[PDB]
Homo-oligomer: A and B are copies of this chain.
Amino acid sequence: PQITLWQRPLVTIKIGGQLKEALLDTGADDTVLEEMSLPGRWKPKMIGGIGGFIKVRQYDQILIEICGHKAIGTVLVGPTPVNIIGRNLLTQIGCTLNF
């Protein structure tokens, strides 16, 4: 699909059997979802942005589907204001910026 940027680029993902809405974000190196139970072990990590650092749990090799495109990769879960799909999974689904 070709997404214009007049509105926030929010899409539907499927994660853990669950549907959620998430922002396609080229500024983020990582994927950060709001707090949720995923199956598997996790380890604590900190990540930062404007404002500061938050503590997240890192889960590895998680399957996700973004508009029907599968990606398998690391997902951080923590008190994010919004679910963010970062470059780790955008490259998997073949996303580019074009102008």
Measured CB to CB, the nearest residue on chain B to A90 is B5
From B27, B50, B80, A26 is in contact (CB under 8 Å) with: B27
Mask for A49-89, Cβ within 8 A of B = 1, else 0?
11111100000000000010100000000001100100100
**A9 CB–B CB distance under 8 Å:** yes
A6 → chain B, closest Cβ, in Å? 6
Sorting the interface of chain A by its residue count into under 10, 10 to 19, 20 to 34 or 35 or more gives: 35 or more
Query: Within the complex, what minimum Cβ distance (angstroms) separates A52 from chain B?
Result: 3
- Which residue of B5, B29, B99 contacts A87 across the interface (Cβ within 8 Å)? B5
A32 on the interface (CB 8 Å rule)?
yes
Q: List 7 A-B contacts (CB under 8 A).
A: A4-B96, A9-B26, A25-B26, A26-B97, A90-B99, A95-B97, A97-B97
